[PDB]
RNA sequence: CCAGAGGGCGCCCGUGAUUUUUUACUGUGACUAAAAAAGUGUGACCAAAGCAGUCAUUCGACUUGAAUUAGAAAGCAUGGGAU
RNA sequence: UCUGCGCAUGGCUCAUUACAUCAGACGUAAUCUGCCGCAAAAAUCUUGCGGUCUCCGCAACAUUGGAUAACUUGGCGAAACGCCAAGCUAAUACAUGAACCAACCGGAUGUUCUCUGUUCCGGCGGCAGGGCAACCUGCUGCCAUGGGACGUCCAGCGAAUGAAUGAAAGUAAAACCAAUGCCUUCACCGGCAGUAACACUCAGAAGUGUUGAUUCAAUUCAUUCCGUGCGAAAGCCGGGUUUUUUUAUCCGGCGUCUUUUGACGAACAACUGCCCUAUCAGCCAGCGAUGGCCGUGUAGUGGACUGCCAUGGCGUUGACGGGAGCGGGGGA
């Protein structure tokens, strides 16, 4: 049992400092892991600064100003990972959070439409009392589930205030995919060959638009849509694209003029 | 049916958990080319079952091969060293070792205790193929799953 | 006994302070069943029912889906199946009675 | 297949609905010579979803009518002979010729199957009146309280099926 | 302190170990519970994840099983006879999984009548059916040979099996 | 809703080696917390530091920035055929 | 002051400690897991009125039950984070307990009656004569493919034990009787064209779980569960109504019992690696040392432990013993 997390135990990807103080927040059990997520009063706080200090922070949140999911939140700590939906009224601004190049996490901007739209991945299928099919996903059960029965590592597309589910969508080749985890994510790519090795990790090999082929493992991926075209979400103004270190540092210096 | 005396020595009888051999009128087949009822399960991992085993006549509770030890992680090989001791071999491995200060290679053992069901019967200085498992004995860890 | 209301019946205590006014304290009543508390009660077991009614009409509908499936299969499995046969059959005897 | 709108339309609204539906987001209506429509959007799915689905259809005063794609089909079912059948009545141990005493003659029949109580049989065009006393009810007759029906099916498909099967037998030993 | 490791055992290699540390409640052993003849008695303890046991202590009481009928009904556990074990146990009459015991024999006799409409059923059932030799002189007599299948200090009930032809003839032998 | 007939591909299983073959080695990829180390950017008045901050005469714009690498032996995938 | 939650975390220190710890890489199908996330839940003869025979008739939104602190009264003790008698009263404490409303599916059955046996050769018998009830004889009823109605007992979650299920994937055309389906006929006449399943009510209301692998998930049947499991807290607060403040008027926010599985954790196992010493060469079984069999114990695996049976295990590619030492990221 620990309760306490540390500054130098905590993420580079949430950005807190060694200095200024010992201590990070430990978030709570919940929908995501302790080792990828945001927390709620790190991303108020630290990015979007209607807070400017911890008092400041729980003085929104308690009040039930802030909405994961279309459920007001309370809790100061509580997590947030990849493919949520984070939707503050009072401000007008709405997130989906996101990956993006460089491995860091980001934060795009959604109107209505979208507001209500999510994506679920399977990590496994089960069966429950009454001979009732039964999913498992990050965020939670539900229950049954047809959009057409089928099969584990493939996506769904969920919807919040009600259940309209459009379809979901497979793993199959020339499908598109992001990734996480791996020191790889916050891509996107095709989907070739998916090499199946038995009892053993489950290797894929991948594509991007205009080549430089690369290649993870097959549970740091999750689908997207069958083509660009055909993406049910928004995603960053990179197009989870890496380009050379060279490249980037050089274009850097010649737009800094101004 | 009456009972063997070349599968019974011990003082409390010996059978399979899995299935009923009290049986009766037959609910089949299940059943092993033909013959009376038996219980043999298929291991995956890419090793497929002896045809022995099947068929067999033993009466083992620790093979993979009619029973319900699982066999999950870590993949051996080795060689044989010597056959004593009731269905426990004991295997010698030999590998190299690197020092970075001297660029030279060394030499080195181990050794392992394995489970070898009845079904085989290696001889010393064979191959073997072994597998990982839960703790059957003090020392015991693995069980074999293909000879050589 | 029934139907009479020990609102009214409670016990009352005085207190003096000299010179601001007194005051009777008497106590809150607990274990009491008002309009307001049969009405909460009795609401929740609607709610109760209602609920495991939707689980019931979730599975027909997963039930159905599955079948209609099923259904389809056979009907189409028997359109190839009938084509083949009775087609190739057509050709056959026709033309050894038409010989 | 694309889908059959029927009872409706005219019409102002008949054109007005024709040019709205047209091209997008999904459908469009495409107008025909009487009271009734194609609406095309069609796929295995959409097949199923159009029926129970009524948007890019209106009413002058009509009563909607979701129709398959073509006009056909619908009055063999309504009329043109009946033929009628009766559910209480037992293959089991009852007897058939109950059936055929009830109706008082006009002979064709069976019962089916090992599965269940239903008969079959033809009283042609006059079984009208005859179901009009028995849907009405009916009751026991070494059954159960019951109801009768009809469409059409066979006749008269039943006797040229049947001759047609005999040809193909004789030949085909 | 009932501890389960191997650290206050010896090496492989005959050597021995040294400690560096005390001993815990996540290693616990609990002192045998012996379950005998007797009206029912039951001695709760509490496990690990706030979830409770049974230890049993005098059993006269059991429900056994035929194979080959499917059925399972009660009985009284009269004497014990064999246990592979130890035949201490045996003249102490305790009652450990896989031993060898003795029951009322009542309840299988009574359920054997049934394998007006019924009248049909009694062929029916009996017809594609024998039963053995081995068990019918037994079943008669009124006493049978079963076999307590339950582990009956965890959970404070004892169920079996019943011992047709193999397993019953390589028990009888003993005797 | 161009049929019959062999072809060809994608999944799944079963049967077949007169004995099927493998590692060290090396190429390219998988997997692997910070602090520290290496390193890109930035006039904290230089500096040791720190991840900041710079513009705009306005109720904000940078779709701000916080790159990148290394980490014995062992483990994992897939190429090479000399020693 | 009662109640609920937390104090097993954080802080501080390196004494013990070399198949020990630890790091890299793996495993738990051998296991437990409060708070947190998401999701479920159709069991139970209760209450009021009237009479009384114990048991009934008549109604329906459950007007539940018994205690104990603070406080007061007497106090005791040298002291004591020591204590006693009596009198008071609470609950989301503790203890009870909810019909109809409220469904789907299956079992076992009645000397229930009515479609019926179309149905005899055998069976079950029921009676008398000889009756020793062995049987022979005569007499007599019912049954020998079945289905409809009516009645009775059982059925939930979780747990134990025994059966069954938990797909298959290695030859090709006719007749035989027992059925039985469909054609077909006045016909229960004699042949195979059609043909998911199947006795109505439901003409598709699961013929189809995941994994490299299961004695797993889940399903069906028979027996069982007694405190050591299962309430709608018999709970709390708002807001709009209503007109009497003061409705069975509607709406919302909290809180809690039981079940299921994720990650916050815990426990267990070991493929590879690490200072000095041979003036440490043999070390391990009476008192478990290596393995085998049935058990016991534990959350679970195991010589973890009992009983019984074998004679193995390790080592000059440094065992065993001793000396120095918390291990790693890292520093000079």
Redesign the pocket.
Known sequence: ????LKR??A??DW?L???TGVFAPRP????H???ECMTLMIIIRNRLKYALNAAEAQMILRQGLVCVDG?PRKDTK?PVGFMDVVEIPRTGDRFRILYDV??RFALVKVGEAEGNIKLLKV???????????VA?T??????RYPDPRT??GDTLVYNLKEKKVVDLIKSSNGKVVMVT????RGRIGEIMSI?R?????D?ARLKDAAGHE????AS?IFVIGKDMQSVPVTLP?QQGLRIN?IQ??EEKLIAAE? | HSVDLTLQH???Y?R?????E?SHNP?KKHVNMSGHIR?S??????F?TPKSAINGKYI???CPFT????????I?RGVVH?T?????I?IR??????I?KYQRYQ???????V?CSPCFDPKPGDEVIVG?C????????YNVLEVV | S??DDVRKYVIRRKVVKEGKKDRFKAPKI??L?T????????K??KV??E???K??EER?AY??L???R??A??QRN?ARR???????QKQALALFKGK | ?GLYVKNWGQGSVDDARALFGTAGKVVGVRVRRRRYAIIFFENAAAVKKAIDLFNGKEFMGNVLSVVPAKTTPKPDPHANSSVVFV??I??????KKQILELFSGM??L?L??????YAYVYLDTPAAAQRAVKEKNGAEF?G?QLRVALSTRSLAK??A??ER?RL??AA?? | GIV???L?????????????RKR?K?????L??HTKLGARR?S??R?????????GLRLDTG?F???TE?????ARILDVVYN???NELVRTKTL???CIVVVDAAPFKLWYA?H???K??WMLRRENHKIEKAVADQLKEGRLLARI?????????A???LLEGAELQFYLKKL
């Open positions: 049992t620990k309760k306490h130098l135990y993420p580079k950005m400092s060694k200095l709570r059990a919940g929908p892991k302790l080792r459920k509580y460089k491995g990590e496994n299928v089960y069966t429950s009392t009454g001979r009732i099919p498992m990050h965020d939670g059960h539900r229950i099969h584990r985890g791996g020191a790889n090499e090795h038995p009892g053993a990790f290797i690369f290649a993870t493992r740091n103004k270190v980037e540092r101004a | 011990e003082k409390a010996q399979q958990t899995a299935v009923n009290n609910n219980y399960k298929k291991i995956g991992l890419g497929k083992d509770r620790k029973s319900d030890v699982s066999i999950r992680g870590r051996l010597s004593k001791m009731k269905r426990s004991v491995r030999d590998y190299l070792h690197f970075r030499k080195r053992h181990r050794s392992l205790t489970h990982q839960r703790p059957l004995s003090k020392t015991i860890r | 029934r139907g607990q274990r069943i309009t307001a508390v049969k009405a909460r009660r009795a929740k077991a109760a029912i609920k495991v009614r689980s019931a027909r039930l159905h599955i079948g209609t099923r259904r299969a056979r028997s009938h084509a083949h046969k009775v087609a190739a | 297949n559910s209480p037992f293959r089991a141990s009852t007897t002979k064709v069976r089916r199957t090992y599965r269940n109580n070494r159960k039943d006797r099926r049947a099967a193909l037998m085909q030993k | 389960r490791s191997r206050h055992k010896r090496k492989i290699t005959g050597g021995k170990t040294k400690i560096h815990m996540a290693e616990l052993g609990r045998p519970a039951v709760p303890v496990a690990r994840g706030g979830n409770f046991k049974l230890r429900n099983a035929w194979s499917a059925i399972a009904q009660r592979a074990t130890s450990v999984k896989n049934k007006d409409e019924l049909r059923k299948t339950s582990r009956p200090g965890q959970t404070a009930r169920d079996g099996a």
